[PDB]
Structure 1
Amino acid sequence: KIPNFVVPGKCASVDRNKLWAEQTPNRNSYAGVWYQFALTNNPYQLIEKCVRNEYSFDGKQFVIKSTGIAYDGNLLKRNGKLYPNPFGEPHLSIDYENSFAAPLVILETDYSNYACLYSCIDYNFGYHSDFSFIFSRSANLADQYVKKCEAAFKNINVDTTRFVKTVQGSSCPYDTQKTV
């Protein structure tokens, strides 16, 4: 009787201090292309299949070009930005044109194979909503790496049975997508 991404209780502690300090020297290694391997039910994401996110780092933020196939079957490009939280909180803000901005934590990454991403918001009625993602440097992602993200999300009490796989691979027009 309520959506599965509206969950009782408060957002979990995920130790952002530690993660922030690991990640600030490594921003250039996080740039380039990342493919969405899987995500939990998200009513905001407008790209359904072939989700490809290209990041450029200018020294203070990332510029993002997100592309793929929209829910109506058309090619779509979205312009985004990733920048430090404006209040000086140890996490990033992910912001998209014609949308809202939300906190984004890099729960775990090795830069060259995978990244595990997390967003959460507390409501005023004793629930939270959270949104989790698994990113890969390739269309595919080996089980050894999926399992690293599974452990990280279990560690903060996210039910990993909520993940759904995203369409990627040879059926995707990536070369067209990268041209906008």
Structure 2
Amino acid sequence: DKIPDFVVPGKCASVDRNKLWAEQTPNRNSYAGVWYQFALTNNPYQLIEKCVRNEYSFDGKQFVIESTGIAYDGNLLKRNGKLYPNPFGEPHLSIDYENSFAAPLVILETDYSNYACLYSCIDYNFGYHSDFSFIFSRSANLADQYVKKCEAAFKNINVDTTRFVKTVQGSSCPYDTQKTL
């Protein structure tokens, strides 16, 4: 039988969150600013298809997010999100979008000034998980050397990096306009 490539047998991977959390907590401010989506794994919840541009402001408690780009229907779209500590005290954040739902998000590795590798995973009740991965860049392109750092980090938690699809980014995107939405 055929199922989507984002439903995978087994339980979400372990991931050492406590380590990442201690490392990332004092650096929140540095995480703010603009991040471009460089690539992601097949994701049926993402409404923005191309030129995905995420603007993060940090108010000391959370990050407020404005995500913009071109939707699947060819129009411009702006979505509002928030990234805040998980409300049960687990050492991960919840990524939440307006009119949608919220999911756990772990920053598996970032150097803050070039790249960030991100990961979200959900267990189902029938022996399968679904995971969603992203490669974020501080600019419209990301150099092979940072891309490989994400590829290693995802390989290390057993994600088939063949699942990544490149996002359209670059001078063909109306970034100046997106910023005004």
Q: For residue 81 of structure 1, report the CA deviation from its aligned partner.
A: 0.2
Deviations 1:130-149 (A, max 9, x none): 00000000000000000000
**Residue 17 (structure 2) aligns with:** 16
The C-alpha deviation readout for 1:70-101, integer Å capped at 9, x for no partner, is 00000000000000000000000000000000
Query: Partner residue of 1:134?
Result: 135
CA distance in 1, matches of 2:60, 2:146: 29
> What TM-score does the superposition give when structure 1 sets the normalisation length?
1.00
User: What is the SS of the residue equivalent to 2:15?
Assistant: coil
Q: CA deviation at 1:164?
A: 0.2
Q: Which runs of 5+ in 1 are unaligned?
A: none
C-alpha offsets along residues 99-123 of structure 1, whole Å, 9 cap, x if unaligned? 0000000000000000000000000
- State how far apart, in whole Å, the 1-side matches of 2:113 and 2:77 are: 26
Structure 2 CA distance for aligned equivalents of residues 84 and 167 of structure 1: 30
Shift of residue 10, structure 1, vs aligned partner: 0.2
Question: What's the CA shift for 1:17?
Answer: 0.3
Provide structure 2 residue ranges, at least 5 long, that are not aligned to the other structure. Answer: none
Q: 2:71 and 2:122 mapped to 1: Cα distance?
A: 25
Alpha-carbon separation, structure 1, partners of 2:67 and 2:89: 26
Report how far residue 67 of structure 1 moved. 0.1
The C-alpha deviation readout for 1:127-172, integer Å capped at 9, x for no partner, is: 0000000000000000000000000000000000000000000000
Q: How does 1:92-131 map to 2 (within 5 A)?
A: 92-131=93-132
* Other-structure match for 1:164: 165
Q: Percent identity?
A: 98
Q: Give distance in 2, aligned partners of 1:64 and 1:47.
A: 14
Q: Distance in 2 between matches of 1:12 and 1:162?
A: 16
- 2-side partners of 1:158 and 1:59: how far apart? 32
- CA distance in 1: counterparts of 2:126 and 2:91, whole angstroms: 26
Secondary structure of the equivalent of 1:28? helix
Root mean square deviation, CA, Å: 0.2
